[PDB]
Design a protein around this ligand. Structure first.
Ligand SMILES: O=C(NCCc1ccc(O)cc1)c1ccccn1
Length: 191
């Protein structure tokens, strides 16, 4: 989680899509969904990201509807966007024990308890926080099943990106859980 406002430059794909849903939160606009193999993935937009400007205009106070209408009306040879990096999230690094554990339980992405004498415990991992990424890989929508499988195959240093549940539940409302599952970019980044 950088302390960074950065500029990204986008390009509507062949069908006029950039692959992005936006959500009004606290008079800001946030990334609710980055679609896999989209403009928005290639430039490296991330769930939770904040969109400060779109073509040099401020997003402050915009409805979701307007953000989306703004995107459609734009001449997608070049869309500029000014981004604040995942501002509602934090990253925690942890090391697995010899039993491979980091030392928590989660349910529906959400960390529900912490296990005494663990790295989870040593590192002040918190409950009531949804899991957003792991070692930099979006994991929103996947079954708990599949998130366990990522954790097991991670190596010792595991890196988790969390978000307060209340904020998380506020971001994803009005998005059908299957769209999340199939269409949210769960892929490692291209170079
Ligand atoms: O993209 C537009 N609106 C955002 C999508 C939408 C949301 C709600 C609604 O009721 C209808 C459309 C648009 C495009 C041309 C003229 C006006 N609006």
């Amino acid at each position: 989680i950088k302390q960074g406002i950065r500029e990204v430059i986008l390009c509507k794909d062949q069908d006029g899509k950039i692959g992005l849903r936006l959500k009004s939160i606290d008079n800001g606009i946030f990334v609710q969904l980055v679609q896999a193999n989209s403009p928005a993935s290639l430039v490296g937009l991330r769930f939770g990201d904040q969109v400060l400007q779109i073509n040099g205009e401020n997003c402050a106070g915009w409805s979701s509807d307007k953000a989306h209408k703004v995107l459609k009306q734009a001449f997608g040879e070049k869309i500029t966007m000014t981004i604040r990096d995942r501002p509602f999230e934090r990253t925690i690094t942890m090391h697995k024990d010899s039993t491979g554990h980091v030392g928590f339980i989660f349910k529906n992405g959400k960390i529900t308890s912490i296990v005494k004498d663990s790295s989870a415990a040593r590192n002040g991992l918190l409950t009531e926080h949804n899991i957003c990424e792991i070692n930099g890989q979006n994991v929103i929508g996947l079954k708990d099943s599949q998130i366990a499988d990522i954790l097991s195959t991670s190596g010792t240093v595991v890196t988790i990106t969390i978000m307060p549940a209340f904020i998380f539940e506020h971001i994803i409302k009005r998005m059908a859980p299957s769209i999340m599952k199939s269409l949210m970019d769960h892929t490692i980044p291209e170079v």
